[PDB]
Structure 1
């Protein structure tokens, strides 16, 4: 089937996005960076390592649900079209495409991500593995281009891996409202959410003993050093995984070992790290079954299926517009 990529991101939109997030976030108390920047080439294959760690249960828990419920998803949503908010590269992507193809209604696949090069390779590989499917990849961001997602058909929107947990409630309700707004009656959303559980398990999931998560987090400093010509002593910064009991969310911080002076070249900015000062690089919100259904409701979607894995570690929601 035909491949198309629509690119709505200017060529240096990424680079200018980084300037805004670093100039702003390194200048608030406490210092904070958005998690969209972990995923250069190094971080991305670090993340790939994380998903295989025995400690990082989310990837396997959601895979387990999907291996068992993908057929029910296809049959319940009846979609002819898979819209992925994500790069389209996981095995879970195939499970859902297979479920729709098996039921005979897979006509189009819409991968939606910010890396046009990754959409390109996804689209070429799905074109090779799924004949008869139109691939319409959209390079854009959630903030602006949900409306550029193609129309015509019954669409199942897919947002897996508890990515929505990387958004704090305010940004989170506003995204789900935006998503419900581009959905048409009879379209549906499959949403993955990591569930609240024992904190010692949560912290271990974000601080594996061999420190792959530690590398992945520290990597954001290398990215900022390379792309904004800053001078972070990457090794003087410790990965710390914290469980915020009140906000019910995992927090990734970077602790400075002793006072640091960091000049961000490309920004004409110098920031001061107190010795032992911590910087928020990621939040990872954990959910309760009822609260997910209520957020979906708040956004104008009606949840019709909830699933957990065998252990109650992780949840998938299927909600309809």
Structure 2
């Protein structure tokens, strides 16, 4: 029920300041952009729905790999502590915890994410399902507070969903290098990476028939409207998903149907969009198996295991110091 440890390194005023800075920088850039972290206001609900769309294969593909190989993953890791870069709300989390329990290894769960309220809820759910488990939640941002994750036990750190694909190569390398420097001998990283495949399937996964992804994308405008007193007309922006073959990444864009004039009153800022002008809201890099090995090695980690679905749509790596 209520048994919990929670460390909170984020402040409400500090997040508000981060949004101010990001929106000012992004809307005044020669090529306009907004960071996708701001998708996930209570947007989080829309993303949950996205994971169940027929076109969006990543979640169910990763889940099926875990469903059939979690015992092997847990045996390879030999960890008694599961660290999740994420909130611990998924079935995937339970697949891993179940296997750790079956192996009589499980002692501790450490969820790491940016919303304290969700960490509390997940902690209560996990606590009830795995009596005796120690839960140490950390509210922090995984590009700054990784050093705050406790080093107790032998740790399996998981970063699922190909969320690592939201980082472009330079910040991605810095992230993996930093994460690797918080690991001890005996610790393991379990990394989910979505893989290069048919480009039609890729684009459709980010431009579903039902329009749910379009709603998710346009909602970042609603976040700016509410939080920074802006007047984006959401109906005036078209959802566009692109495959960038040079960078091998999916991109989400918002395209102005007609010229728009947007005042972001909280920033004392007026922003103009030309008819047809596009603003970048997300990248989702896709990986080649051989390159995953290389990126891990450059970060100081040796890939010891690789799991992929029979179609080769998605990959999971286990890597060690």
Q: Same fold (TM over 0.5)?
A: yes
Post-superposition shift, 1:188?
0.4
Could you give the per-residue CA deviations for residues 266-314 of structure 1, whole angstroms, max 9, x where no partner exists? 1111111111000000000000001011100000011001111121100
Residues 122-144 of structure 1: CA deviation (Å, up to 9, x unaligned): 11111111111100000001122
Is structure 2 residue 21 aligned with structure 1 residue 20? Answer: yes
Corresponding residue number in structure 1 for 2:167:
167
Alignment partners' CA distance in 2, 1:142 and 1:271: 31
Runs (5+) with no aligned partner, structure 1: none
Asked if 1:140 is matched to 2:140, the reply is yes
Q: How far off is 1:82 after superposition?
A: 0.4
SS of residue matched to 2:272 = strand
- Per-residue deviation, 1:12: 2.2
Deviating above 4 A after TM superposition, structure 1's stretches of 4 or more consecutive aligned residues are none
> Residues 33-83 of structure 1, C-alpha deviation per residue, up to 9 Å, x if partnerless?
111011111x11111111101100000110010001111111000000000
CA root-mean-square deviation: 0.9
- Give CA deviations for 1:5-35 in whole Å, capped at 9, x if unaligned: 1001123222111111101111112101111
- Partner residue of 2:316? 316
What are the equivalent positions in structure 2 for 1:252-263 lying under 5 Å apart? Answer: 252-263=252-263
TM-score by length of 1: 0.98
Name the structure 2 match of 1:181. 181
Matched length: 320
Q: Which residue of 1 aligns with 2:32?
A: 31
With structure 2 as the length reference, what TM-score do the two structures score?
Answer: 0.98
Separation in structure 2 between the aligned mates of residue 106 and residue 172 of structure 1, nearest angstrom: 30
CA shift, 1:156, in A, is 0.3
Task: Indicate the residue corresponding to 1:85 in structure 2.
Answer: 85
5+ residue gaps in structure 2?
Answer: none
Instruction: Show CA shifts across 1:145-173 (max 9, x none).
Output: 10110112110000000000000000000
Offset, 1:196: 0.3
